[PDB]
């Protein structure tokens, strides 16, 4: 009659591509974990006292335990050196940079230009403002990493600006998919 | 907690009893690869181009749900445990691309801390239900075991057109809808 929730997942942890690999598998029930296996452990442990005989029950079947250990090479290492190498690893999306500003209605009045950067992948990106060829960092406010949910990322930046005559404000952005650093400017 | 270069979550089995609610999905680096349909016996990809360059056996994904069903079946009788209190979700409405009046855009409704993952997500164009261009994506998981989902909506922005995102959740004492307008900007 009442409600309950169960969850299973398998996590492949990669470092430097294929040099050091780690395979961990969780067993979640009711937003709680009770049995876990780690490639650095070599067997099934018990996160809670509930799955203590369960972990040893799966530690009592030697044929099944080796398939799990071999799954580090069959599931994790093969997919990284296979599908992902042919799909996700070779996926690059360039960001879209736009400069806008709200709350301004008069000339030479304090405000904070907004540099908006959306639809980019992967997430290894940084953004820096540039006034007249000088990287600005004082009074800078920016959104955090906003996952677009469709194989893209977005993030916005705002710089508290004073409308000085003879001004060149540039939103400089560098990215690995961006073979060249993109610079979008704005003036009075 | 733990760090790595990249992490791909292959195999996401979730079961909810009663009602026999299941879901199988693949994921990588905070991003879904594809999901296997339960009853139509097919593998649906979030992006089609990766389905043209890779194929997954949907039978293996169903064996996961079948064992998990057997898993939860033994675990619900093994313990007299009480249900987890239904967490109240929190949402955020945002556009995919910058707002441009008269230009097509995709309005997204991201909702985090969804627990249990049983919730209707709908839109209201000027307090009127519109089901055109609605993409209901599969749930996601984060390392606190809560879940987050996304929903998309294509539209034409205008000052006289106000939009919002409706939420129908179990733990909510009442349905909540955060109203966003490009007219405010």
């Amino acid at each position: 009659e009442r409600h309950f929730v169960y969850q299973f997942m398998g996590e492949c942890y990669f470092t430097n591509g294929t040099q050091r690999i780690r395979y961990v598998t969780r067993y979640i029930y009711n937003r709680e974990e009770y049995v876990r296996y780690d490639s650095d452990v070599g067997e099934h442990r018990a996160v809670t006292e509930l799955g203590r005989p369960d972990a040893e029950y799966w530690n009592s079947q030697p044929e099944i335990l080796e398939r799990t250990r071999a799954e580090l090479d069959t599931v994790c290492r093969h997919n990284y050196e296979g599908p992902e190498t042919h799909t996700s690893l070779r996926r690059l999306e360039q960001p879209n940079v736009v400069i806008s500003l709200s709350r301004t209605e008069a000339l030479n009045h304090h405000n904070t230009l907004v540099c908006s950067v959306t639809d980019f992948y992967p997430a290894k990106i940084k953004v820096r403002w540039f006034r007249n060829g000088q990287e600005e960092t004082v009074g800078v406010s920016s959104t955090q990493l906003i996952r677009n949910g469709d194989w893209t990322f977005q993030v916005l930046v705002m710089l508290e600006m004073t409308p000085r005559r003879g001004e060149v404000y540039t939103c400089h952005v560098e990215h690995p998919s961006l073979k060249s650093p993109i610079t979008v400017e704005w003036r009075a | 907690d733990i760090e790595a270069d990249h992490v791909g979550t292959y195999g996401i089995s979730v079961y909810q009893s009663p009602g026999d609610i299941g879901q199988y999905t693949f994921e990588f680096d905070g991003d879904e690869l594809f999901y296997v349909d339960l009853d139509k016996k097919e593998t649906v990809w979030m992006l089609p181009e990766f389905g043209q360059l890779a194929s997954f056996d949907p039978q293996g994904g169903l064996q996961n749900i079948a064992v998990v069903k057997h898993n939860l079946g033994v675990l619900t009788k093994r313990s007299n445990s009480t249900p987890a209190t239904n967490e109240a979700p929190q949402a955020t409405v945002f556009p995919k691309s910058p707002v441009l009046l008269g230009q097509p855009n995709t309005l997204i409704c991201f909702v985090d801390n969804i627990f249990p993952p049983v919730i209707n997500i709908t839109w209201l164009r000027n307090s009127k239900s519109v089901a055109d261009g609605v993409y209901e994506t599969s749930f996601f998981v984060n390392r606190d075991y809560s879940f987050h989902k996304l929903s998309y909506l294509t539209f034409i922005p205008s000052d006289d057109d106000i939009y919002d995102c409706k939420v129908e959740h179990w733990g909510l004492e009442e349905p909540v809808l955060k109203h966003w307008e490009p007219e405010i900007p």
């Binding site: 099944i64 | 195999g11 890779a54």
Partner: peptide
């Protein structure tokens, strides 16, 4: 051609 994606295999505790 293409390359298939191998999944993670779960386990089944006894009754």
């Amino acid at each position: 051609p293409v390359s298939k994606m191998r999944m993670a295999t779960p386990l089944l505790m006894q009754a």
